[PDB]
Amino acid sequence: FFWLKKAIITARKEQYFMPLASVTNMPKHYGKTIKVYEYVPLLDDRNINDQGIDASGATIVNGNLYGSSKDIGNITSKLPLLTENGGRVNRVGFTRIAREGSIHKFGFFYEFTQESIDFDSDDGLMEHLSRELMNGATQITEAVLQKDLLAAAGTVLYAGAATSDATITGEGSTPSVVSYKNLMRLDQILTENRTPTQTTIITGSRMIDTKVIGATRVMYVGSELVPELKAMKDLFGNKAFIETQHYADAGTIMNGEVGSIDKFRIIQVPEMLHWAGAGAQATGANPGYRTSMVSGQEHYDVYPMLVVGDDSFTSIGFQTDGKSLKFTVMTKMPGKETADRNDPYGETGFSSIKWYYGILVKRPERLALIKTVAPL
Amino acid sequence: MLNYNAPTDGQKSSIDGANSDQMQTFFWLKKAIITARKEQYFMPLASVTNM
Amino acid sequence: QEFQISDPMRKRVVAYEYWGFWDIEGNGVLEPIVATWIGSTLIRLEKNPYP
């Protein structure tokens, strides 16, 4: 038999969350912590101070005129009014808040032998090993960032009628699947929190059979939820999902986009992470939703669906040359350099990689998330 | 009044809420205090004989 | 090693020089300089004299 002298290799896995993150420069000789101030407006409820005098000259508990309350009676009760011979009547107070983040360390290494280096039939083995090492490092770092983002969400909307992760179940009267009304509510919440948009509406083209789409935000889903999204129907019973070929004209298709529903442009991320066993126990009445085995009991699987806003978070950069993350690689080939003091044979070697990673969440209200089950 | 109070010795400023304190509360010179070498007297009275 | 001439003016001490380029004015243009220091004291600092 005759070896082909060529190898079969699988490329990297493309990364979606890492490119979004912005980088904040942190000089050394300071520590492992970064902090910022945040000045709250005058009228928000967060303005808890002790500098209040009402219109009658008497001290009052709250220093903000009226909170984030739209009630007309409350506003009329707490309006600032001034008489003609006015003096020392209305006082206001201010407040600032601080936030922080920290840097953590990572790393891994591998070993090999000189006889394996030489006598091996394949030539260029160590190049392959370096390639897989680097790919593994990149994939791990992306997974860590995605995990931290999912853990640090600020706006959470459970689907169906659930309240916590243990309650999200796909069996019974009301299964916990994503619905059109849930997406409408998520849009409403983001609009109320003043989150800026990302894209713009797509008007029509002149070519036959081309629908008009007005989504304005970007949403990341897993691979498992795509059939569920495709099967969704809107309020009037028609189809909801609009595929990309309809509006590819008169618009720009983003990377890894599957379609548009309501006001979100769905994006499929291959390396999306899901919880395992978070849901309630699954009996034999399963309609066909994915489950998992935890402690011998079949529990449902709770799935993500995430809408990262703008300026929500930044990535601390420690000696990264203004990048999100930079790796450090070392190699020592066998020889006298690796001739151990108790073993001058020197038949082995190694290669190691390490980095520093940390994240600062400036505003956690902009991050949004939906938890659902995913069909099998 | 927006009094300053004293952030050190446990008395927060008026402007700060319940989470934040003053960032900078002291000035640092960045020049240190160092001690000189002790003099040597018996060393000069010695001539080397290279072996 | 222990050699020392009687007159203080004729004692020999080790010094360092630095021949290189630096941004004197901070506007982005590198210019030649020369610097000289003994121990921890900087004695001479000027541009490159040679044409």
Inter-chain residue contact A95 with B23, CB threshold 8 Å? no
Q: Do chains C and A touch (3 or more CB pairs under 8 A)?
A: no
With H, G, I as helix, E, B as strand and everything else as coil, classify residue A140.
helix
Inter-chain residue contact B48 with C4, CB threshold 8 Å? no
CA dist., res. A337 & res. A367, Å (int)? 51
Q: Does C40 touch chain B (CB under 8 A)?
A: no
Q: Which residues partner with A109 through β-bridges?
A: A352
CA dist., res. A346 & res. A344, Å (int)? 5
CA dist., res. B15 & res. A366, Å (int)? 26
Chain B contact set for C1 (CB, 8 A) = 48
The residue assigned the tokens 């300089």 is C33
The residue assigned the tokens 């222990």 is C2
Cβ contacts of residue A160 below 8 Å, gap of 6+?
Answer: A168, A174, A175, A176, A177, A179, A372
Q: What is the DSSP string of A206-221?
A: SSSS---B---EEEEE
Residue A306: what residue type?
L
Q: What is the distance in angstroms between the Cα of C13 and the nearest Cα belonging to chain B?
A: 15
Q: Taking Cα atoms as reference points, which of A301, A299, A229, A274 lies closest to residue A369? A: A274
Cβ contacts of residue A281 below 8 Å, gap of 6+?
Answer: A297, A298, A299
Task: Note whether A234 and A180 are within 8 A (CB).
Answer: yes
Q: What is the DSSP string of A291-349?
A: EEEETTEEEE--B--EE--SSSEEEEESSSSSSS---EEEEE-SSSTT-BTTBTT--EE
The residue assigned the tokens 């160590």 is A126
Cβ contacts of residue C36 below 8 Å, gap of 6+?
Answer: C15, C16, C17, C18, C42, C43, C44, C45
Task: Note whether A113 and A347 are within 8 A (CB).
Answer: yes
Q: How many CB pairs under 8 A join A and B?
A: 26
Chain C contact set for B43 (CB, 8 A) = 2
Task: Note whether A259 and A244 are within 8 A (CB).
Answer: yes
Chain B contact set for C4 (CB, 8 A) = 44
Task: Note whether A366 and A195 are within 8 A (CB).
Answer: yes
Please name the residue of chain C whose CA is at the shortest distance from the CA of residue B48. Answer: C2
Inter-chain residue contact A96 with B23, CB threshold 8 Å? no
Q: State the method.
A: cryo-EM
CA dist., res. A361 & res. A368, Å (int)? 13
Handedness of CA A247, A251, A257, A260 (dihedral sign): negative
Task: Note whether A347 and A299 are within 8 A (CB).
Answer: no
Neighbors of chain B by Cβ distance (3+ pairs < 8 Å)? A, C
Token representation of residue A10: 């699988």
